[PDB]
Amino acid sequence: GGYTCGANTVPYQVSLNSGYHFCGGSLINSQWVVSAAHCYESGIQVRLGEDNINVVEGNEQFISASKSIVHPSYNSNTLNNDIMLIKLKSAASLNSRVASISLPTSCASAGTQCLISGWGHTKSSGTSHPDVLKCLKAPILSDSSCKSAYPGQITSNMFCAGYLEGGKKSCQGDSGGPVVCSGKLQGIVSWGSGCAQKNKPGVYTKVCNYVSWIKQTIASN
Ligand SMILES: [Ca+2]
């Protein structure tokens, strides 16, 4: 059922704001954020150090995005390759409440526990969500169970995490938000029925497939 994370306990969590909070993301170094390609839009301000997104509480850093880079192979219909990089106009000041999260060196396996965090905003969904950061500890599901949950839709660039029993909904992640497992960013909140229906898993972009692209893109921009 998840829980309130606690202010600044997820220091890599970011809010993307274009007048209002519209997506999450993950700080991966002082000047770059990873999010979902379906989060793309103009005039992004990156908000770090947030807990309540409607109240200035004292640990925020607001930094304009200088550049967004959608994956070359992003398909908005299938959500294959749902990943985007956002460069910050200035480097964030890193401390205990604002910190980067490591990229994976290896992919994660079914059964591994992950932390999904966010304010529960699914972009363009029109759905209600809280103003403080929420968290869910959830396991990665097997390939076969993921495909069985979403026949014909799961590519090699996606994985499922969450619960197939319990009779609850999981609405913690924002579009573009982090799935962190054993201190590595393994997933990005992409799509699924995990919030709309009970007993369904979320679907996440499989970050480990993109580490080479992320590193090369950052190194050149
Ligand atoms: Ca705030």
- The percentage helix is under 10%
- CATH class assignment of the largest domain: Mainly Beta
Look up the CATH topology of the largest domain: Thrombin, subunit H
The count of domains is 2
Round the Cα radius of gyration to an integer and report it.
16 Å
Question: What is the assembly state of the chains in this entry?
Answer: monomer
Please trace the helix and strand order, writing H or E for each element: EEEEEEEEEHEEEEH
CATH level-4 homologous superfamily of the largest domain:
Trypsin-like serine proteases
**Approximately how much beta-strand content do the residues carry?**
25-35%
The kinds of small molecule bound in this structure are: calcium ion
Q: What's the number of extended β-strand segments?
A: 13
* Biggest sheet record: 7 strands, antiparallel
* Order of the strands making up the biggest sheet: 1-9-8-11-12-13-10
Q: What gross morphology would you assign? A: globular
**CA(first)-CA(last) distance:** 40 Å
The DSSP helix count reads 2
CATH architecture of the largest domain: Beta Barrel
Structural class of the helices, strands and pairings?
mainly beta
Please give a structural write-up:
- Interacts with SERPINA1.
- Keywords: Calcium, Digestion, Disulfide bond, Hydrolase, Metal-binding, Protease, Secreted, Serine protease, Signal, Zymogen.
- It holds the Pfam family Trypsin.
- It catalyses: Preferential cleavage: Arg-|-Xaa, Lys-|-Xaa.
- Residues 1-219 form the Peptidase S1 domain.
- By secondary structure, the protein is mainly β.
- The chain has 2 domains: 1-10 and 101-208, Thrombin, subunit H, CATH 2.40.10.10; 11-100 and 209-220, Beta Barrel (Thrombin, subunit H), CATH 2.40.10.
- The protein contains 2 helices and 13 strands; from the N terminus they run E-E-E-E-E-E-E-E-E-H-E-E-E-E-H.
- The protein has helices at residues 143-149, 211-219; strands spanning 3-4, 13-17, 21-29, 32-35, 45-48, 61-70, 84-88, 113-118, 134-139, 158-161, 178-181, 184-192, 202-206.
- The strands form 2 sheets. A 7-stranded antiparallel sheet has the order 1-9-8-11-12-13-10. A 6-stranded antiparallel beta barrel has the order 2-3-4-7-6-5.
- The N and C termini lie far apart (40 Å).
- The structure holds calcium ion (CA).
